[PDB]
Amino acid sequence: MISDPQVLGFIARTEAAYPPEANGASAADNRRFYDAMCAVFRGPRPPGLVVGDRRIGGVPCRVYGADSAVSVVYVHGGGFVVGGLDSHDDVCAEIADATGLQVIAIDYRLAPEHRWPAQIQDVQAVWDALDRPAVIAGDSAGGMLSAALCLSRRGQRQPLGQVLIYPGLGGDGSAPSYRENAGAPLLRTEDLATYHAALHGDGPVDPLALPLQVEDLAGVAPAFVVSADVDPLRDDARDYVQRLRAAGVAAEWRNEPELPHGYLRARRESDRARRSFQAILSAIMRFAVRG
Amino acid sequence: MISDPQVLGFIARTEAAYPPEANGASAADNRRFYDAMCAVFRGPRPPGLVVGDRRIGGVPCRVYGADSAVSVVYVHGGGFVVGGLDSHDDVCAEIADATGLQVIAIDYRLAPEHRWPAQIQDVQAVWDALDRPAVIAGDSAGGMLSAALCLSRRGQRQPLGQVLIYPGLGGDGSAPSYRENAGAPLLRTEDLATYHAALHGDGPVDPLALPLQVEDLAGVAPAFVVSADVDPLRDDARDYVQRLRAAGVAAEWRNEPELPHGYLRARRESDRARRSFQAILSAIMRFAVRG
C-alpha cells in the first residue's frame, strides 16, 4: 500500500481529474480526458524560453530553447493513443530550461487510427532529420518508442543515451510487478491490454514493438531507466536494465518507492516525484555531456 | 517587485516563520530562529540514502550517498552567523540523490565568536582532507566561501567546478542591485553589513574574503553562478562572472526573475524556485562529468 500522503493526494487529484466514463468513449474522447487530466498538473513555461512549433522530418514537433551542440528528443507517453505536444509541454520546457539543451518533442501519429509501426516511423523521421548528437527520453509509451528508436539506431547516429521514464517495454507479463501491482492506482495491468489492442490490432506483433523480447540488445545507447515502484510496468525497467547490462550496455535502474505510474505530473506536489524528476534531469545532463 | 503568487506566498510564510524582534537577540538566539524557519520549509531525506556524520579535516561534516568517483562539497549559507548541517540537510541530500555523487556538507565555525579566516580555514581543511575530484557548491555566505576556496586552491587540487547560489562575493555595494533591491523581501541591503561586521570584527580585510576584489582570478574552477533577481546581492553574481570570464575561466550566469534571496527553501512550493534548483543540479552534474 502507498502510505506517502502527498502521493495519496496526487492519486486522488488524478482520479478526480479523469472521469471513469468508459462507455462509447472513443479514442477521441480519451484524448480529451487525458489532455484535461494533464492540464490539472501542468506547470508553466519558463518565461524567457524560446519555443517553436514546426515540422521536422515531416512530423509536427515543438522545439524548446536555442540550438545547442547536443539536443534532447522527448517522446511523450499516453499508451500510443493519447498525449501530444501540449500534454507534456511543461516536462519538455523544464528539461530545456534546466540543462540548456534544445528539446524536440514529437507529435507522432496515434493509435488506433494509425497502427504500429506508424509511431516508431515518426520518431525515426524526426531522429533522422535531426542529424545531430542527442539524448532520447520518454515516459511510458514514449519510453518504449525511445527504446525502439535506440534498437533501430545503433550505427553512427546512435543516441548519446536513452532516459526511459516508467517505460512499458513489452515484457511478457510474468515478472512480479504485473501481479504485485495489478491493482495499482492510476495503471492496472488490465489497462495495458486496451493500448496493446489499439497499437497492433490482432495481426502480427512486430518484434521491434517489444524491446524486452528482442533477442540481441547489444550496441544500443547507454540507459537510465526509472520505474515507479507501484506500477505493473515496474519490472520492465528492471528486466530491461538487466538485459542491457548483459549485452554490454551501461545501464542504471532507479526504482521509485511509493510512486505510481504517471508520477511526472506529481513533481509539483510530491517530494518523491520531484526528486525523481531531478534525477531524470541529471541523467539527461550526464548523457549529454559524455558526448 | 515580485508578482508571482507562489513566491509571494513563500515570502509571507517565511516572514511568519521568523518573527523579527531583534534588539539584543544573541547570535545564539538568531541561530535558533534560523533553524526554526528552515524547518518549516525543509523537505525530507530520500529514505534509502545513506547519511553519516563525521569529522573530516577536524570539522564536523555530513556525508550523503555512497562513495563516488566525483563528489560534491556543499557549503551552507547563513551570513557566516547561522546555519549548519541540519538547516540545509534536504538540499544536500537532494543533490546526492539526484546526481548519485557523494555530497560532503561542512559545519564550519561561525561568526561572531569565530572571525575570518576561521570559516575558510575550515572549508580548506575539509577540502584538503577529502583529496578527491569534487564540485564545490554553496548558497549565500556558503557561495563566498566556495569561491574563496577556489581562489586559494588553484593547483591540481582545484575543484572541478564551483556552483554559487545567490552568493555574496564582496561587491563594494555600488552595483544597481544594492539600490534596486534595497527593500527586497527576505534580504535587504541594510542587513548586509551586519554579516561582514560579524565575519571580520576588528580584523584585517583579507582579499580572499572579497572574491570580487581579488585582482587575479586566473585558473579558478569554471563556475555556475545563479542569482535571485530580487536580491541586493544579485549583481555580485553578474560582476563575478564577468571578471571570471575576462580572466579565462568558463562561467555561466543565470538570473532568476521574481525570486528573492534564499529561494532554495521555496523549491517545494514555487515553480520558479523548483526550476532553479533543477538547473543547479544539472550544472553540478555537468561539472562532475566534464571533470
Q: 3-state DSSP call for residue B154?
A: coil
Angle between helices A118-130 and A141-152 (to 10 degrees): 60
Which entry of B231, B235, B236, B239 is annotated as an active-site residue? B231
Which entry of B87, B90, B261, B276 is annotated as an active-site residue? B261
A250 in Cβ contact with B251 (< 8 Å): no
Q: B97 to chain A: which residues are within 8 Å by CB?
A: 275, 278-279
Q: Which of A48, A98, A275 sits opposite B97 (nearest CB)?
A: A275
Q: Where are the domains of chain B?
A: 5-290
Nearest chain B residue (CA) to A42: B271
The whole-angstrom separation of Cα B185 and Cα B187 is 6
Nearest chain A residue (CA) to B99: A282
Query: Among all chains, which residue has been given the C-alpha cell 518504449?
Result: A144
Encoded amino acid at B94, one letter: E
Please give the positions of A annotated as active site.
140, 231, 261
How close does chain A come to B78, measured CA to CA in Å?
24
Encoded amino acid at A25, one letter: A
Q: B44 to chain A: which residues are within 8 Å by CB?
A: 271
B262 in Cβ contact with B13 (< 8 Å): no
Exposure b/e, B179-192, CB count within 10 A at least 16 = b: ebbeebbbbebeeb
Contact A98 B281 (CB under 8 A): yes
The whole-angstrom separation of Cα B122 and Cα B128 is 10
Q: How many residues does chain B have?
A: 291
Q: Which residues are within 8 A (CB) of B182 and not within 5 positions of it... i.e. 6 or more apart? A: B188, B189, B190, B232
The whole-angstrom separation of Cα A65 and Cα A61 is 13
CATH H-level superfamily of A5-44+51-289: Alpha/Beta hydrolase fold, catalytic domain (3.40.50.1820)
Method of structure determination: X-ray
Q: Write the burial class of residue B160 (CB in 10 Å: 0-12 exposed, 13-18 middle, 19+ buried).
A: buried
Interface test with A, best of B70, B268, B282, B290 (most A CBs within 10 A): B282
May I ask the CATH architecture of the domain B5-290?
Answer: 3-Layer(aba) Sandwich (3.40)
Detail the DSSP E strand segments found in chain B: 51-56, 59-64, 71-75, 102-106, 134-139, 161-165, 223-230, 251-260
Half-sphere exposure of A30 (CA within 13 A, CB side): 18
CA angle B65, B73, A267 (to 5 degrees): 60
Please report the DSSP string for chain A in residue order: ----HHHHHHHHHHHHHS----SS--HHHHHHHHHHHHHHHPPPPPTT--EEEEEETTEEEEEESS--SSEEEEE--STTTS--TTTTHHHHHHHHHHH--EEEEE----TTTS-TTHHHHHHHHHHHHH-S-EEEEEETHHHHHHHHHHHH--STT--S-EEEES------S-SHHHHHTTT-SS--TTHHHHHHHHHHTTS---GGG-GGG-S--TTPPPEEEEEEEESTTHHHHHHHHHHHHHTT--EEEEEEEEEETTGGGGTTT-HHHHHHHHHHHHHHHHHHHT-
